[PDB]
Amino acid sequence: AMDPPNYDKWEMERTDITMKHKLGGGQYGEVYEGVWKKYSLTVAVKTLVEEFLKEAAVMKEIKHPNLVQLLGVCTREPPFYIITEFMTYGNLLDYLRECNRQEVSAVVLLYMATQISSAMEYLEKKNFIHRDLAARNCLVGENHLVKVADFGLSRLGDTYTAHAGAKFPIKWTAPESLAYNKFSIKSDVWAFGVLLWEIATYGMSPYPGIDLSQVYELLEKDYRMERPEGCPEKVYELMRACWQWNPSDRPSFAEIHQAFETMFQ
Ligand SMILES: Cc1ccc(NC(=O)c2ccc(CN3CCN(C)CC3)cc2)cc1Nc1nccc(-c2cccnc2)n1
Ligand SMILES: COC(=O)c1ccc(Cl)cc1N
Ligand SMILES: [Cl-]
Ligand SMILES: [Cl-]
Ligand SMILES: [Cl-]
Ligand SMILES: [Cl-]
């Protein structure tokens, strides 16, 4: 930590953190479990350049109860660290697959959807684009608390597939993103509808068995995924709204969050 001369309040003493093993069996790349000794606090620590420093810069501009919280950075000297909170129950997709379904009931699914749409309303308000919203990019803490993250998973199976030295998760990717490389808050809104279907099925893969090279074709012919067992009609209506072909026809996250709020009470 710096003395208030290029001061950055986020810079911390690398030595304050005890680095343990790679997190989640190595599924996150160079991310480690850590203890910030002086707070007795378990943390997540991503390590390694422009991309990495641009990510740290972005995280300093964002703060929301449902976005994973940046705690500090070590970016003076290598090896560079970005340090965030550690969320006890791990990524949402695995959580939903593994959970006690009597505990994670219909109302809990509603609560998860609602928290995520909150985070996305805040990114929408700040003019940020997520670009890879999916259950695999969300984290679960105590009492069903859910936060949106971005683990940079595209180069870490067939979830992502190549597009010009880019890899895209086709089944979460809006039609104008597939066809024109156009990303916006409205392509996040499309991805959010897919996320809602993940939550509604307790973590099933979307478009089951559908070959990736026929996805665009099908969507252009108005095919959409069917309503999951037990999913309220109103929630399915929101999903279908998120999957409107023209991005301008899709609701805002402000609208979506308000719709879930109304339901969640
Ligand atoms: C250690 C770390 C470093 C960086 C990040 N970064 C982000 O999560 C993030 C979130 C949002 C943005 C916003 N950004 C807007 C612009 N578009 C293009 C991209 C997204 C950027 C980065 C998270 C983490 N946290 C993290 N990473 C991997 C795994 C875990 C983890 C695993 C299990 C239990 N608890 C925590 N925790
Ligand atoms: C009561 O709300 C629900 O049942 C519910 C809400 C969100 C999702 Cl994604 C699925 C559900 N099944
Ligand atoms: Cl300051
Ligand atoms: Cl995890
Ligand atoms: Cl952005
Ligand atoms: Cl937690």
Q: Which domains does the chain have, with CATH numbers?
A: 5-86 (3.30.200.20), 87-265 (1.10.510.10)
Burial readout 139-161 (b: 16 or more C-beta within 10 A, e: otherwise): bbeeebbbbbbbbbbbeeeebbe
Query: What stretch of H or E contains 124?
Result: helix 106-125
Q: What is the whole-number distance in angstroms between the Cα of residue 162 and the centre of ligand 6?
A: 34
Q: Are strands 166-168 and 161-163 parallel, antiparallel or unpaired?
A: antiparallel
> CA–CA separation, 5 vs 84, rounded Å?
25
Fill in the amino acid letter for 213. S
Residue 59 CB less than 6 A away from ligand 1: yes
Resolution for this experimental structure (Å): 1.8
Burial readout 187-225 (b: 16 or more C-beta within 10 A, e: otherwise): bbbbbbbbbbbbbbbbbeebbeeeeeeebeeebeeeebb
Q: Whose CA is nearest to atom 3 of ligand 2?
A: 106
Widest CA span in the chain: 61
Q: What is the whole-number distance in angstroms between the Cα of residue 102 and the centre of ligand 2?
A: 14
Give the SS3 label for residue 22.
strand
Q: Which of 126, 213, 125 is nearest to 168 (CA)?
A: 213
Q: Residues at the annotated binding site?
A: 23-31, 46, 85-91
CB-CB contact of 46 with 30 (8 Å): yes
> CA–CA separation, 87 vs 197, rounded Å?
23
> CA–CA separation, 226 vs 15, rounded Å?
52
Which DSSP string do the residues of 185-241 spell out, in sequence order? HHHHHHHHHHHHHHHHTTSPPSSTT--GGGHHHHHHTT--PPPPTT--HHHHHHHHH
Fill in the amino acid letter for 239. M
The tokens describing 6, both together, are: 């290029």
CB-CB contact of 219 with 170 (8 Å): no
Please name which ligand lies nearest the alpha carbon of 44.
1
Give, in degrees to the nearest 5, the angle at Cα 133 between 130 and 135: 150
SS (H, E, C) 143-190: HHCEEECCCCHHHCCCCCEEECCEEECHHHCCHHHHHHCCCCHHHHHH
DSSP 95: H
Pocket test for ligand 2, best of 96, 99, 108, 110 (most atoms within 8 A of CB): 110
Paired with 138 in beta bridges are 148
Please indicate the experimental technique that yielded this structure: X-ray
Query: What stretch of H or E contains 52?
Result: helix 50-59
- Residue 78: CB atoms within 10 A of its CB come to 10
Question: How far are the Cα atoms of 82, 115, 158 from residue 60, in angstroms, in the given order?
Answer: 11, 21, 32
> CA–CA separation, 147 vs 70, rounded Å?
12
DSSP 142: G
Q: Write out the catalytic residue numbers.
A: 132
The tokens describing 192, both together, are: 């959010």
> CA–CA separation, 121 vs 177, rounded Å?
21
Q: How far is CA 112 from the centre of its chain?
A: 12
